[PDB]
């Protein structure tokens, strides 16, 4: 269920891709494929609680030296 | 039932702008608005950052990191706080925590200190948190004070003191790595079974070590799961690193035409896409600039540790493969290091770094952020970073080292009533 | 009608008005006396200390629910004098039942914490009592007294 | 010509009568009179120096509130001795924990482009004092203070010290 | 410069006691209670005896039963009564009290002897209103 | 007279000293007391001298001999060890198992500079810091 | 709380002049003690030496070293240091704490200028001169 970013038919399939990477210029740096997608979904207008709403944040360097 | 509740909230404005500084080494908090279980939460920080008139002109950047956690108010008041929801209108209010007299002595919390020296913990500890998990070297040891009291000026007026970026000095093999094991034995005889399962034993330790650390990571380790919170990890949510750079600003008159002085001027968005508040609690969002470390005095492990041996210049895989730390000093990286302070270095690791190089002639100058002379205290005083180090580049500290405009664009989609009933009673 | 039940205490005092409260002028001597209560004395003691608590609250219109500790120390640390507070505690400490109030709500208080929030109260450190007014004032407008 | 808009030394719109009348040289000059806040002017129009060795001198406390150890100080004053009494001149830093009366033990002394004729004393200038303490409990001071081995006579006039610790705006109507 | 509520509410002890004279104590007792001579391993009951007995006061003096003193009051009475000599014996005496704060807060934090010692030390240096009286002198 | 932080110990150590005795030999009072420099090979020898009188100054006074006091074991090394030896002695001190530095409640081990502070200050009582054979 | 800064300060001086081996060469306890003053590229020497008064023994016998706390620093400097150069002298130091700080885990790094102003009062209550000593040259090598 939960998505999280990435640390530091078919035509339309490929088209929501493009529009997950989009995003992950915008929400950082990259995303797990399957977040990435739900990441596509999301509607900046729907005030009612979207799944892309759920994410943590993952940074390369704490998690391989453990501190900023 | 509460039922269709998972949707219908209005989106509130908790968007404001602050005008802020900080000294150079130090995690400052920039702004901290409360969510409540069930809001969704939306930033979109932008504004300038800058350095002092710096007394010479533009020479080395510095790095600039905007973080912003999440720390649900269970793992502050815990449990006290169970019970608090749980009671209601009834309970005994959440706790405080004091501060020292001073204006600016709540400061590092991104509050003026109020009339009573009393801030909710949570503001607190949510810090304390934060420091001890993110930005302390995990070596180093938790940061424990009950309310800032405790704090020196420095530390609670300013934000407390991070550590240098990654370093071959300044980010060494924790500081008891190791560095053989033994297994007892008869006089005349080694247990070959026993020998198996002392090393079974020294791998499990090694990687649990590293790799392990957290309830979750052993459980997990088991192919189950778990929601264990208590470590109180806080939540990090969104950083963005800039690097933070402006323009000289040339000299032009008469006394002074070859002169000039450095502005740093940088603009910058730090934006935090709508994220999901599942109970109540505190969102900090704090800043850290950092010069890189470059010092005017390092070495190349190899041309100073002197007389080089095969292992040392060979760069065998198969030697640095099965060969643990070795125990660097200081003076072998270091144009003048206390060689009584040594730490433990990754056998390899000389090829796998390359010092940053200050040419003598800057050396004895005035105004350049290289580190001067080499650190002298322990392995984390040596890591940590002094700040006034960098006065000396500044024409004035008289608004701290780096200050920075900024408007916290924040809307919040939560649900509070109208001004109806609100305010009409009725 | 806003006076915060600390000032009632203070300015009931500086003036001194037992009359306010309910204590004859001798009453408000014996509590306020330097002359140490003995066992025997006890009860008017507490008669005494209570009278000023459930007092100065009604000198302020709070209805009255059974009264709250930070309350009961201001007024220990107010009237009784220094010789009497430990046993000025000591005597607002049980949950001594009276059918003239709610022990709906009757709590044991508890003595040494009772001591040490007076102790405190004494020292110059008012929030203590304000921070709990403020509690006090909520729990019952939601309660629907106000 | 354009007016000039630049003093080494501002003095404060408001000036003190010194109360005090008899002054007597020391090695332990005596401070003139209580020293206020950050900028004063102090001015005399009888002022009998008991002959003996030593100085008195004049002070503004440091105010410590703006980050910055090196800040500048300035003393403005003109001084008229009855007699000339060959002494110098200069401005003194010294710190105290306590309201000083006297120029204590250990001080610190600099040069002030001043200029001398006879027994007169005329001086505009400024120069930068650490005005951080150096020593935890104090409060640093700096003043003016003439020193000679006088010998008793009488000096008039006045003057005034200065802390550049913030600007003081003045009107320049081409602005 | 800091006037910590810890601080403050020793202070406001110190005080507490001037006033409040009554102890229980013989003459003898607040001898070396007060007394410079140092005490030994065999007195420690001695010493807590009276070292108590300053900080229960009248409750003790009368029959009253006792109440866990906030720590800032154990201080001030070691800091008040016990001199010099005997301050930090007279904590490990005393150890186990908590501070005022965690009274209050329901985080039981009972304070080791070392802190105790700390904080009367410290409680100690608002020496001035710490000038005896020989109608202290004057309770048996 | 922040000397004040020491009496305790320091007049415990008098007394012990005067009448009873520690866990010494005569020799082991010697490295402890001498003004041989101590060497690397030394530390142990040090250290279980150094404790010794520890513990002894605590049990004269009733004190248990667990979390040694930092105040006391500054007065002895301070009172005991030669001045050609105090700071390696504080060195050993270092960590050492009993001692047990509380602030704000937190029980750190004994860092070496502070104890030679402490030492350093507690040495500024130099009457009685006149350690006499006889004399 | 200063009495007794100075007071450690002094003791510091009896603690030192006792100090069993100076791991100084001859020369080198001149840049450090002679009257020609320092030019700024000799501070690192001065630093050693100045260093080596205060970790002495310890570096030759093989302890590791760790921070004096200042009083020391200052009586060392006040003591071996020439007037001509106490001053860089001071500001090569600058950065350890009071003894009091130490003692009471508050990190404040005591800046040049007090490092001075404290050497300098140890300097003037001193009285156990060096020159007095010259025979301390004795304990000055590897023997």
Redesign the interface.
């Given at each position: 269920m939960e998505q999280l970013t990435k640390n530091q038919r078919k035509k339309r399939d490929e088209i929501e891709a493009g529009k997950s990477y989009c995003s992950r210029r915008f929400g950082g740096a990259t995303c797990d494929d399957k977040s990435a997608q739900i990441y596509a979904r999301f509607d900046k207008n729907d005030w009612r609680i979207q799944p892309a709403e759920f994410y943590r944040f993952h940074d390369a360097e704490v998690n391989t030296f453990g501190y900023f | 039932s509460n039922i269709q509740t998972g949707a219908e909230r209005m989106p509130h404005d908790l968007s404001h702008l602050g005008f802020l500084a900080g000294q150079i080494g130090r995690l400052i908090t920039i702004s901290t608005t409360p969510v409540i279980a069930g809001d969704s939460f939306e930033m979109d920080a932008v504004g300038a950052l800058r350095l002092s008139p710096l007394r010479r002109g533009l020479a080395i950047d510095s790095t600039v990191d905007i973080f912003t956690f999440y720390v649900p108010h269970r793992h502050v008041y815990g449990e006290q706080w169970i019970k608090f929801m749980k009671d209601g209108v009834n309970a005994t209010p959440l706790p405080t925590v004091n501060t020292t007299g001073y204006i600016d002595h709540a400061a590092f919390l991104g509050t003026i200190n109020p009339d009573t020296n009393k801030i909710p913990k949570h503001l607190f500890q949510g810090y304390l948190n934060i420091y001890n998990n993110y930005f302390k070297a995990p070596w180093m040891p938790d940061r424990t004070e009950a309310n800032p009291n405790e704090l020196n000026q420095d530390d609670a007026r300013f934000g407390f003191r991070c550590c240098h970026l990654k370093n071959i000095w300044t980010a060494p093999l924790p500081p008891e790595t190791e560095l053989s094991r033994q297994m007892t034995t008869s006089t005349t005889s080694i247990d070959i079974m026993g020998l198996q399962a002392a090393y079974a034993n020294l791998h499990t330790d090694q990687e649990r070590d590293y790799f392990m650390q957290r309830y979750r990571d052993v459980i997990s380790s088991f192919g189950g799961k778990t929601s264990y919170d208590a470590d109180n990890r806080p939540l990090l949510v969104m950083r963005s690193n800039l690097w933070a750079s402006g323009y000289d600003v040339d000299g032009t008159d008469q006394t002074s035409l070859g002169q000039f002085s450095g502005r740093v001027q940088q603009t910058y968005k730090h934006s935090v896409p709508r994220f999901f508040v599942p109970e109540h609690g505190t969102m900090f969002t704090l800043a850290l600039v950092r010069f890189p470390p470059t010092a005017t005095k390092e070495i190349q492990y190899l041309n100073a540790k002197g007389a080089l041996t095969y292992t040392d210049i060979a760069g065998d895989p198969v030697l640095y493969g099965n060969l643990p730390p070795r125990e660097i000093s200081m003076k072998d990286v270091f144009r003048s290091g206390d060689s009584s302070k040594k730490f433990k270095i990754a056998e390899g690791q000389w090829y796998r770094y390359a010092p940053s190089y200050v040419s003598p002639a800057y050396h004895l100058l005035e105004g350049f952020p290289f580190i001067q002379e080499p650190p002298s205290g322990d392995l984390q005083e040596r890591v940590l970073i002094r700040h006034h180090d960098y006065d000396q580049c500044f024409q004035?500290?008289?608004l701290?080292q780096w200050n920075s405009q900024v408007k916290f664009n924040v809307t919040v989609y939560r649900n509070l009533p109208t001004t109806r009933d609100s305010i009409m009673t009725s | 009608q806003s006076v915060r039940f600390q000032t009632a205490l203070a300015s009931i005092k500086l003036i001194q008005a037992s009359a306010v409260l309910d204590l004859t002028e001798d009453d408000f001597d014996f509590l306020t006396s330097n002359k140490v209560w003995i066992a025997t004395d006890r009860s008017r003691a507490r008669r005494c200390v209570e009278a000023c608590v459930y007092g100065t609250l009604d000198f302020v219109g709070y209805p009255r629910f059974p009264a709250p500790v930070e309350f009961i120390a201001a007024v220990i640390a107010y009237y009784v004098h220094p010789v009497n507070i430990q046993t000025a505690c000591l005597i607002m400490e049980g949950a001594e039942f009276t059918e003239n109030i709610i022990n709906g709500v009757e709590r044991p208080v508890k003595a040494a914490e009772l001591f040490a929030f007076t102790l405190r109260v004494r020292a110059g450190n008012t929030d203590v009592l304000t921070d709990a007014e403020e509690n006090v004032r909520q729990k019952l407008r939601a309660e629907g007294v106000m | 010509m354009f007016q000039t808009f630049i003093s080494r030394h501002n003095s404060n719109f408001f000036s003190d009568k010194l109360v005090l009348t008899s002054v007597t040289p020391a090695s332990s000059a005596p401070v003139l009179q209580t020293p206020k806040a950050t900028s004063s002017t102090l001015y005399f129009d009888s002022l009998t120096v008991n002959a003996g060795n030593g100085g008195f001198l004049h002070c503004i406390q440091m105010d410590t509130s703006?980050?910055?150890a090196n800040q500048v100080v300035s003393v403005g004053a003109d001084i008229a001795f009855d007699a000339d009494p060959k002494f110098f001149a200069c401005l003194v830093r010294f710190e105290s924990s306590s309201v000083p009366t006297t120029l204590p033990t250990?001080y610190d002394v600099y040069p002030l482009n001043g200029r001398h004729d006879g027994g007169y004393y005329t001086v505009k200038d400024c120069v930068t004092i650490?005005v951080?303490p150096?020593?935890?409990?104090n409060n640093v001071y700096v003043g003016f203070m003439v020193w000679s081995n006088f010998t008793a006579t009488k000096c008039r006039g006045l003057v005034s010290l200065n802390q550049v610790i913030k600007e003081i705006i003045c009107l320049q109507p081409l602005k």
């Open positions: - | 004035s500290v008289q701290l | - | 703006v980050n910055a250990a650490d951080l150096r020593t935890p409990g």
